[PDB]
């Protein structure tokens, strides 16, 4: 897997972000996670968390997995990094996302994220409280 440059356009909610990638605007959906919708419990906090993470970054990077790179809605499917820290992993680690939508062939970081989820749940953080 490879990290590729991109620049923030707009944080959208806990697990979607608009980025400029290869010079084109696109909505990215974070692989292997599910945050609550903004209307649900911890939704605003997931949104706020993702936003701060990408807005504070000097460097945003996109990492595609080995399988499909866009979903059925045209959203990019990637791991997103903020100054080298994976946003997908961080959300799970804080108990602001569940590991979710694990499809064969786009699951390189599954076991890393499940480990973070186990730590969040142990700590009774946020959605696990």
Ligand X SMILES: Cc1cn([C@H]2C[C@H](OP(=O)(O)O)[C@@H](COP(=O)(O)O)O2)c(=O)[nH]c1=O
Which stretch of DSSP H or E encloses residue 59? none
Between 13 and 48, whose beta carbon lies closer to ligand X? 13
Residue 29 CB, nearest approach to ligand X (Å): 5
Residue 33 CB, nearest approach to ligand X (Å): 7
Between 34 and 63, whose beta carbon lies closer to Ca ion? 34
Closest to 50 in 3D by CA, of 92, 20, 84, 22: 92
- The CA-based angle 118-120-54, given to 5 degrees, is 115
Between 13 and 121, whose beta carbon lies closer to ligand X? 13
Q: Which of residues 67-126 bind ligand X (CB under 6 A)?
A: 71-72, 77, 101, 103, 106
Q: Of 45, 75, 89, 93, which is the active-site residue?
A: 75
Q: Which of residues 57-76 bind Ca ion (CB under 5 A)?
A: none
> Contact, 23 vs 8, CB < 8 A?
no
The C-alpha atoms of residue 94 and residue 102 are separated, in whole angstroms, by 19
Of the ranges 30-38, 55-63, 72-80, 99-107, which one interacts with Ca ion (CB under 5 A)? 30-38
The C-alpha atoms of residue 124 and residue 126 are separated, in whole angstroms, by 7
Closest to 120 in 3D by CA, of 42, 5, 60: 42
Q: Which of residues 22-41 bind ligand X (CB under 6 A)?
A: 29, 31, 34
> Catalytic residues, which ones?
29, 37, 75
């Amino acid at each position: 897997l490879h990290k590729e440059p991109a620049t923030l356009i707009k944080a959208i909610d806990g697990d979607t972000v608009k980025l400029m990638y290869k010079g084109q605007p696109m909505t990215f959906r974070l692989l292997l996670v599910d945050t609550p919708e903004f209307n649900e419990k911890y939704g605003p906090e997931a949104s706020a968390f993702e936003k701060k993470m990408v807005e504070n970054a000097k460097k945003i990077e996109v990492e595609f997995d080995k399988g499909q790179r866009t979903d059925k809605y045209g959203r990019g499917l990637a791991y997103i990094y903020a100054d080298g820290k994976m946003v997908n992993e961080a959300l799970v680690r804080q108990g602001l996302a569940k590991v979710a939508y694990v499809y064969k062939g786009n699951n390189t970081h599954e076991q890393l994220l499940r480990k973070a989820e186990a730590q969040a749940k142990k700590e009774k953080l946020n959605i696990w409280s």
